[model samples]
Target: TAYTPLDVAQAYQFPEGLDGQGQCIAIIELGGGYDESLAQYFASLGVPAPQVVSVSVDGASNQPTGDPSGPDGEVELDIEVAGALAPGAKFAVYFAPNTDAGFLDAITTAIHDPTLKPSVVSISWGGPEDSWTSAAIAAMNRAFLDAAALGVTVLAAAGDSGSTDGEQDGLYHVDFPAASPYVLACGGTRLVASGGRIAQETVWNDGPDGGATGGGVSRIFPLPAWQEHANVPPSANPGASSGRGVPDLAGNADPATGYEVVIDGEATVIGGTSAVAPLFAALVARINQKLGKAVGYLNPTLYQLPADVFHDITEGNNDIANRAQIYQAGPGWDPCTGLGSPIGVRLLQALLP
Candidate 1:
């Protein structure tokens, strides 16, 4: 059965007594828009329905297509999941064209927006590492570096395709932006909850054509200083090389166990590493509310936490097609699920300094 966004959040042990008040979650969308009916959606969840401020980037604005399978699904899923988890936090939805330049512009704009001053940015759009020019990748990494220095948290989807990342090439590939060490790469999982708690969870791998969590090592970025001891392995493809790992963490993203949301005025369930990005965004917003400061660039700090603070997924793999067992989940950091999913309150307490 599909889970409500709040159920998934609480299953991760997201802290209570905090509604992400006084925080702004900047969501970068490449297309589609939220309708006024979101108020009705929030009402269904008994949420206050926080304000969503639309910000256009690269000549793209909040334009809905009323098709849940299209960008509208992504747009509403991001808002609804994030909003449901952190109902008191406002949102700055940055709508931009689906282009490398437009994506970069949206991230930088959200990070540097003087008026909105969003403390965290959630990006659910990304392509394989090879799909982007080296220059584009470098430019966006620099923007994330800027975000790091400015104390703004940035999160991105670790793609939905599996280890090969949908490339016909016979090599393991990770998604861009998410593969960048500067951004927190959110991966996916198949989660089963019972009695308001997570009963079973594993790496999300459906098949070659079916969706799974995108992960593995980055061909472009070198391993960050923080992950030096995580025992991150080299690429699984032939001529394997060591580089940055894909996802920093994961969340529920299996369509079989997707999030409940309203897209284009239609109730539907959606899942991907995309949903995981905003899920953590809202979690961090609540963290920021509790800490009274942004937990900027969380990779280093998160890596230091003990295994108990996370679920530590140790089963399943992201192998697709005939590429058997490309990357399997194990103790600690694995290519499939990273440091596993959060044990939210413990994570928040661990982050307290």
Candidate 2:
């Protein structure tokens, strides 16, 4: 059985009373589109449909591709999860092409949009570090930094292909954008909820073909000041180098334990590190609504939060494709599921000044 967005929200003990009434969440989409009928999905969950507007970035618009398993699934899953969790939050869906320039432009545009002024930006698409140019990485990093200065929280999906990231090379890899120091890299988990509480939570590893959470040390970007004391291990490859870790946080992302969402008018379950990005995006929206202020660039403050704020997933490894175990979950922060999943209310309280 798939968990409803509300079930996931409840599992996290999301704060009550605030509906993100005044906040706007900006979601960046590479392709695919969402139909207005998705409001029915929220209505079934008893959530008021959020106002969703599509912004074309580089000529990309809200054009659905009908294939439920394609990008359409990603688009709807993002909006549905984020909107359901923050029913009153407005959505500005930025549709862009599947290119480096398109993706970067979409993020920069959303951060500075005068009409929406989105406080949180959720990105559900990214590639392995090997697939990007140094120039593209630097440009997007600058955009993320701009988001920080503008009091905007930017979150990106770590990856879904485990440590190898589906690279033909034998060495392990971490996904880009998530590997970027400035963006909050959201990882994945396999969560078993029982009686409205977490029963079992572990790193999302579903073998070679089934997918696993993507995480590891970044070969390109160096370690950020925030993660210095987190005991981030060295890169899990031969001749490994010091650098930033992939994910800063985690949530449920296993397809077997996935989210129920509407995709191109079909109800289906979807999962990936992609789902985690918006899952936390809505949480941030709710937090901002409660505090009446954006918790911009949470990394500096997240590492210092009370230990109990997260569930602490300490089992499973994200090693796939017959590779040695690259990363494992431990007592504290680990590449697999960084601070573990959130205990929403506790996180909100801890984020308070």
Candidate 3:
């Protein structure tokens, strides 16, 4: 069974003063619909009812549907869990058909829509940055930039396929959106708790199932000069190495300790960096509520905070193949889990300028 609601609420400290009363969290769903029944379940748990709204683009139905690429489950869990945590915030779900053009269109629409002006956008769907066309990449980047200029934050899953580009080695890349410097790249970890409180957390790397925390070299994006001391390994293919690596931050994403979320009227278990992206988004919302200002571009701010706010995982690597390089946690910044997951309200407090 996935971690229970009681466990999640306790581990993440949801009952604290982190109520996101006056923020809007926009979620980009390429496919699937959230079950209203799940909202009722959250209400039963004493979570306030979220203002859930859906905007359909690309002519996709607003009903739940499945996709092999993990759209249905990803969409449901992201919006629902974020809503459960920050209920006072408006929840906007933007839907697009599962096509490259459709996906880009939905994002562009959401970023530009005035009626649905979101302070943060959680995107759980993406392919490798290298696989996407230059035009597509530019469009996505432009949208993120537009949102950012308006002080909006964008969070994206770093992918569940470890570090081998989701097992597609031809291009050898990291997940897109996450790879984009404009967005916050959320990674995964296995969290252990005792007495209803978090005891330990580490970078998630399921060796038996060939699972590991996703982080690696990028072929298209040049390494941002700001990451000069990030300790990222040099790329194997010099030409493909554009200096960009993945997973700006992390949260609990291991299936062994995944979160419990219901989908399609069934009590189901789910885990992925997909969940972590929105989890952080909700946390950001809560922080914004307290700070009375949006925390725009958290990468630099997170890097400046003390290590005590994060539980550094100094062990493990996400090398699916023996040939790929191993990513591990370390003293400062490393590829495995950058700056580590949030602890207490430090993440919220640190964002205050």
Candidate 4:
């Protein structure tokens, strides 16, 4: 398996000064329970294990039944990647069922919990935009707005099913929560690095075995102000100006180029937009450390950063199932690898004073 956090940090030349010492990472999960294997993994790496606190949201908490194929795997990926990147940050993992009410309740609970006051929350679950009710989305958006106002940065996975979003509807669709415009939608990248240098990087797409990254214009919400000047092309479909674009940023999510983590005493490899959201959250934690506080909603500040702070992926596409109408990675930001991966230190410089 690939080296955990050390490999990622050195490959990207991550900042050395701040290690997210005083931050708490909020991990929102839909169904998995608490994992104890993390302690072993951290011990093996000789890093201080984060004091992970498990909180019940909508009657769901750490209750893993030893099913490696269930949400447990997802929960592990979320915590491991983020924690590995920001070893000094604690973890507040909120678990709930995979229902609309469960999802909303968990999100709001984590947001409004005065006790935790997490500076960055990473959400790795989402369905197609239409898969959710408008009312629920509005409620979630309001919670995100509260988070923004309260200085909490939220990062969410865009999805791994490419344009179809795991549906056979045969139309391009962006995943929910990610398309909400209130959070930073994390995308995916097929990264190839060797010889102490990045050999190749592009929008992630693996077709059948490992589904491509999800990206496209939303059919629900309109383009937000921050992206208005982004030169985002109009939708090629009938409803051209339907909504805001998905994926504010991307990370390494290709399974062939996935992350290595321990899952129930076994070393395993995992990939998906799920892995990247928390990675970004941990990065945000370090930024919070550098600034001595949270950066809150990063959309406005993100688009304002200099182009050199990001590694633009000019190739690859997320047009698998519906390849004819899929999004492509191009010159700056396309739906695929939005804005591009961070030059970690550069991104921190731009975000911090």
Residue 31 in model 3: lDDT: 76
TM-score between candidate 1 and the true structure: 0.98
Residue-level lDDT tens digits of model 1 in 223-266: 88899989998887677678999789999999988888888887
lDDT of 2 by residue, 111-209 (tens): 999999999999999888979998998899999999999999999999999988989688789998999899999999998996779989999998987
Residue 271 displacement in candidate 2 (angstroms) = 1.0
* lDDT for 207 (candidate 1): 89
TM-score of each model, in listed order: 0.98, 0.98, 0.91, 0.96
What is the C-alpha local distance difference test score of candidate 1? 0.90
Per-residue lDDT of candidate 3, residues 78-124 (tens digit): 77778888888998888888778888888777777799788888888
Query: Each prediction's Cα RMSD?
Result: 1.0, 0.9, 2.4, 1.5
Query: Which 10 consecutive positions of candidate 4 have the poorest summed lDDT?
Result: 1-10
Count steric clashes of candidate 2: 0
Sliding window of 10 residues with minimal summed lDDT for model 2: 320-329
Candidate 2 residue pairs in clash (backbone atoms < 3 Å): none
lDDT of 1 at 340: 94
Candidate 3 vs candidate 4: the lDDT winner is 4
